[PDB]
Amino acid sequence: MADPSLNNPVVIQATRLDASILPRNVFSKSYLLYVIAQGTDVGAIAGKANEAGQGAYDAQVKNDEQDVELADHEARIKQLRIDVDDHESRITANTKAITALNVRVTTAEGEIASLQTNVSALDGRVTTAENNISALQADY
Amino acid sequence: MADPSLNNPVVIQATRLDASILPRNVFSKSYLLYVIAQGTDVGAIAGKANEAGQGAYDAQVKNDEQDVELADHEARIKQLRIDVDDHESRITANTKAITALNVRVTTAEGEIASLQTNVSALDGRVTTAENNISALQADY
Amino acid sequence: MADPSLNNPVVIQATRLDASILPRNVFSKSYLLYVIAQGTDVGAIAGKANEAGQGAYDAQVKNDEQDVELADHEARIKQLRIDVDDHESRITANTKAITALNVRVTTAEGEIASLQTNVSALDGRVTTAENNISALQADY
Ligand SMILES: [Ca+2]
Numbered sequence A, B, C: 001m002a003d004p005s006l007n008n009p010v011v012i013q014a015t016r017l018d019a020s021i022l023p024r025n026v027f028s029k030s031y032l033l034y035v036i037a038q039g040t041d042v043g044a045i046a047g048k049a050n051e052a053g054q055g056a057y058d059a060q061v062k063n064d065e066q067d068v069e070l071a072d073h074e075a076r077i078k079q080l081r082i083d084v085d086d087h088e089s090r091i092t093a094n095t096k097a098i099t100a101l102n103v104r105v106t107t108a109e110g111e112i113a114s115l116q117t118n119v120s121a122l123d124g125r126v127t128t129a130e131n132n133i134s135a136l137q138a139d140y
Helices: A029-138 B029-138 C029-138
Strands: none
């Protein structure tokens, strides 16, 4: 998790050099300019170090929130896997059930046709029988 | 892409400063105090730069692991997409199959009904015919 | 969003130290070695701070790209989630339809069976009728 110490800037405990206080007769000129320039530059690098700290810190907070989002996505994916596999099972079951039901209805129609033929035949024979009855009754 | 150099701190100086090693009849008060706090400040900025660098490094490592996790999530998600599309196909197929089977069962039942009514007709006419036969046989 | 200012290095006006610019008889050995070491090392700290800044920047841009990919993952996951829920619904519906169709077909077959028994009985009765009629003209 993001490290808050990166949010603490360094405050410069030194005071911006006054060019009155440097030793007069002991230093060369070039070295004087060197000390002053080094002071200013120390200030600047301090600033850069602080800003860098803040950049890395923000990178870390972003990484943390993205870690939460990644875990969430992972979980969602896993739930979705359970659901999809269950769905696979139930789909297969439904397809097989449809096919089996189809062979059953096929057999049913097969029986229906024969029943139709039989009922027609019985109808004809019954008609002939009725005619014979009427004929036998016609005489006495 | 990860830079290990960000995890390598710069080691400053060699020897620490107390005003012992300082000349100190040559330096004024303000400049003496300036040398010391500046020493302290250089130490502090070294520390801040190092910690910031390390923080950025850790941010990069986290970026790497998150990249791996992102790739994993990508593969898993795309596969789930293909699977879900397959499920869509089979579901549609099953719905259409059910629709096709239902009208089939309907016509089968309609024909069963017609066969029922016809059978009832035959069963009445057959009963009446039996009555006529029995009457013809009775007289006699 | 990524801050490009982290890629802007501090340029240190001081390029440290020469044996020409330094005072001589005034400094102690330890203090001289301290000045030299301080010169080289402060520069080094500048370099490290700059490098750290660059690292933080790279971390931020990488975070941005990962944000785009994460958003993509979010959208895809939620969409496939609703789709999977839809599949759950229609699968359940299909299972219920299959069960209902099965309940219909069982009863239909039962009715077919009853029809077969009835048509067989009618067949026998019609045969008996044929024999009785045939017998009735047989004796005339
Ligand atoms: Ca990241």
